[model samples]
Target chain A: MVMSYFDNFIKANQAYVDLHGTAHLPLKPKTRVAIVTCMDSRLHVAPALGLALGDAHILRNAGGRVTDDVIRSLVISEQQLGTSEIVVLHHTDCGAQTFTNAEFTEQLKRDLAVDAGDQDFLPFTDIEESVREDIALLKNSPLIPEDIIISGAIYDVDTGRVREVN
Target chain B: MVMSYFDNFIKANQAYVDLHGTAHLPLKPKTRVAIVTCMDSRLHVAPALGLALGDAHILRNAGGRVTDDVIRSLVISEQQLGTSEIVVLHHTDCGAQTFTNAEFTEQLKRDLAVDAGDQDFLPFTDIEESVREDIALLKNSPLIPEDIIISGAIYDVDTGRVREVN
Candidate 1:
């Protein structure tokens, strides 16, 4: 038996495009749909979002925070990936919900002697609020398309349900 | 069955604290690690990276592409959440791999009657290369901790592997 629908998600991704036609974007036909999300193993966007392989560009960091590197990637993607839509997905019971930055830094300071406070970075605030802000930031970013459709959503890890933050 | 480790994850996050005692930097004793990764459901960072709940601050966005908002979020996290470490994680076989930005924009023009190209939005090219460039961009961004430790890695959907790009 298959491990789970998510376990079979890869096969499902190929099957999805075959059944629904590629969910390619319009203007940027080559590659569209850029996503920034977390590295949690439990979530599966392809099957859940019904996105096929080669249909969108997926970028994951630790918490999907928008940072300089993320913006740089977007600049290149918009200039190259052909993506038009931007989706910011956050989740419930997230690790970000529990931790603070100072404690995070001291851990590394002892293990690697690295300073965390001096780094340029972002942290998770409220999911809904952060998602909204992220969408606006993408919409307003000098590196991103000003007129593109931008949206944000929150995924409930417990129920596997996604709710648009609009 | 509970069907998810989310509840446990949350509990774990709250229970854990920074192993390293605070002393090195100006960081408050309350700070923790921060991760900026993609929203791709396929990628999982905590276990693979040997992280626990409350261990760090996580900021997620779509495509994991960094934007001004991302920077803003990071700024807030550092100032408020006490987070410091920034990790950039993207992944393999992502749904974002589906279409080229050009094709997506063109489709929007034809199907949705929207002009994405005019708006200057597109997708990225060569993900690994982009990841490398992002690391440089994050390191250079003034908004981030100039001395904070920043790293980049790519997650493989098929093999559940994370390869560092630093």
Candidate 2:
């Protein structure tokens, strides 16, 4: 088929609409929690966390690192949407663990002709350590409240298991 | 049970790991695409879009609104990960539509006791319009190539139907 990759998604959505009946879920998440995780394709946060529709806010990035932007979204997730807890989830066999920032930057500089210049790709060698680092980032951020419960976990991509880091 | 929210996710993940088993998928996404969407709890992107594990990179934020961080992520998603297509998905009854940036800034200042100061919350009054605007942002970004395919859609929170916008 000549259709683009997105065409498949748009096509699949037709069936989803029929399957998902017209029911209104509240804007605020039912669990009142926000999950911060990586953009690894294998880790589907909702299903892995046993979350139903309208359950919790899932915040994702390349490494699921607690970047400034993540803190921004989380601030909104909590202050505006009433979430009180955060789960920092990283995974094993992740792309983030595959490369160092310097190596990836060199690759980009070669391929894209763009000097990314000291940008932390936020890659990590240790999944557990990464999770702990992100947890600390969130806990120390002025945007995230001290009272909000925060935890960290590492998910195994192959086994599909998430274990608490602590 | 008095279990913390994070504990529930950890518990759920153990079950997920059992069901998932050991399947080795490549680091690169099978489908060279990335979907940028809202962090709405109701709209599970994988099932809604008929995507399997390793299909695509999913980048999510408060409104699925494009910011420097989004562009930065996309640059890495494409430059590092090899995705060529982008989808901007906004949903009906979005919290982004519920309040203006001004109102949110005021709320943040009063509640969090910090001056947000001229930051755009990126809220919108219209969903489709917001989708269109984000699409434009991606199209206009220097980091994003001119040839990359960019599309927009509105996912109905009630119906779970995603209808293409223009």
Candidate 3:
């Protein structure tokens, strides 16, 4: 069935309303999911995934890469936000994929005098690999529930489709 | 100068590792910014924006729509996250753009026996207009810092670019 523009809009608004209404404080059932992802402007989470407001907890960082800090937030999200599922969303044509760590680091050091080794760290080469690594990192974290479901996906910035990667 | 493949990986991984290392936080940074966005799988916040761990306080719901609860969270984000800047990131092909409030309310009543109006609600027809309304809501809220730096953007899910709206 073809939905007119108005038809689709109605469905979405209702989802937002329902999810918001049903949320429980300190981790509502409505927001049971958590997301960690990059800062690319091309991706939309709700309309693309059919999520309603108050359905999930979302934590965004650069590359949506998992670091020790993300774990802390996840801990709080699980301990506080009632999150049980995690989705790590990355995308094709990510700017992060455009450069390597040394390039940015050197640039930052030369341009901004920001020394990176002084902070938390992770390792990855390609964008997809980095995404895969972060998902694994979350799964391996002691703070996260082992049974908690974690999934990874790549958003085709050009196609508007999210491809799940196990 | 252009970087080699290995250099690119190293450069990207360097930042990743540095940020990842700093992830070991027993505490969160003073909230410098608060973001309201959707819980979509396609939108990743961190790497695309070059934000490190604990840089900004994030608040997300389905549709990333700003309503009372979202406002409540924003209030707390200001109070708790120490964020003075509010960035509302919406995106193209938003699911909230797909349906109206009535259909969603109907679905809720039929499926969960819930009334949608009991919740603080806003029906979204135009994504950009909705964003503007949210900004207005925050600007007028007696609870938030009237001068807080509030900005809105529509992320191009197909292009990985963030375009500021209002």
Candidate 4:
């Protein structure tokens, strides 16, 4: 256990490999759905969502906000692959809630000595509002068809529960 | 079982919530590392990497290729939060391998009647090369610190194994 986390993770994968046996899951997700959520450590989308292997596409970022990259990924998911539904799963006590654009710009300047500027960091205060806002972005995007069943939810990281946002 | 995956996920979450009582974990990841990987459903980063809650930030997109939003998310992760190490994990038989820029453009036009131009889809034929290419993207970026530990690996979906690229 004293080994590097990366090395330890590799070690752990061996055990999983044994249990996994050999499953050549298809390129497209079986569920034909994608979960857009945060990079939060606590929120493991698979077990939390009851997703088995090849169940659904799971996209994550800082706040799981609907950025251009998210749209790009989603377009690929829907167009090339076959995902019809998307879940904007924001979580409680997110890192996005801890800072603003102004704050990040200032912090990065001092710490990394880099001009990060006022990029669209997409920080938000309330989880529900953030989820709702992201849902709106998805709904409004031309790439994401109106037929795409977009839903919003806030994951209570404390209790491992997901509640509907809108 | 017959219900929508979204509703089924909600039901699954309730079971998880009941098992998970309530414990407020910190915003910062425990391991000080972030996993950049594909949105592939088969490779669940936490269980595959032996990570518990509060272990590491997990960011996923279409191909797990580092993009602008990924860098944005990584910046927030390190500067605002405190993850210094990064793992760019690709996988075998990836969806990114199945199409080219020209192919995607044609597919989108026919499928959705939308002219999605040759945007950076980050498609790759080989998994190892893709992993190395993404690692290069991370190290060369100004926003990412020089000391940030950037590593690359390929996860085998069939076997659930992770092997270092370089």
**Model 1 deviation from native, Cα RMSD in Å:** 12.5
Expressed as tens digits, the lDDT of each residue in B27-134 for candidate 1 is: 221224556666443344443354333344555544565666566566555644456666677666543465576676676565445465754232356777767766
Best-to-worst ranking by TM-score: 4, 2, 1, 3
Model 3 per-residue lDDT tens digits across residues A7-104: 22223344333433332222243646676765443344443454443345565544566754466455545543356777787766554454455554
Residues B99-139 of candidate 4: C-alpha lDDT, one tens digit per residue? 99888888888887888785778789988988888989898
Which candidate gets the maximum lDDT versus the true structure?
4
Misplaced by over 4 Å in model 4 are A1-3, B1-3
TM-score of 2: 0.95
Give lDDT tens digits, candidate 3, residues B1-166. 3322222222333333342332122122333666777654445444334444445555555556665545544543444334567778777765556545566556545643545534432446688998898788778765566657777877555444566686
A21-132 per-residue lDDT for model 1 (tens digits) = 3232232323356666654433444434545343455554445556555665565455544566666777765546555666655654665455656653445668888787
Model 2: how far is B161 from its true place, Å? Answer: 0.7
Task: Give one digit per residue, the lDDT tens place, for model 2 in A74-130.
Answer: 988898899998888888877787778788778877876777766777888988888
Which candidate would rank higher by lDDT, 1 or 2? 2
lDDT of 1: 0.53
* Per-model TM values vs. the true structure: 0.47, 0.95, 0.45, 0.96
Which segments of candidate 2 are over 4 A away from where they belong?
A: none
Q: Which candidate, 1 or 2, would have the higher DockQ against the true structure?
A: 2
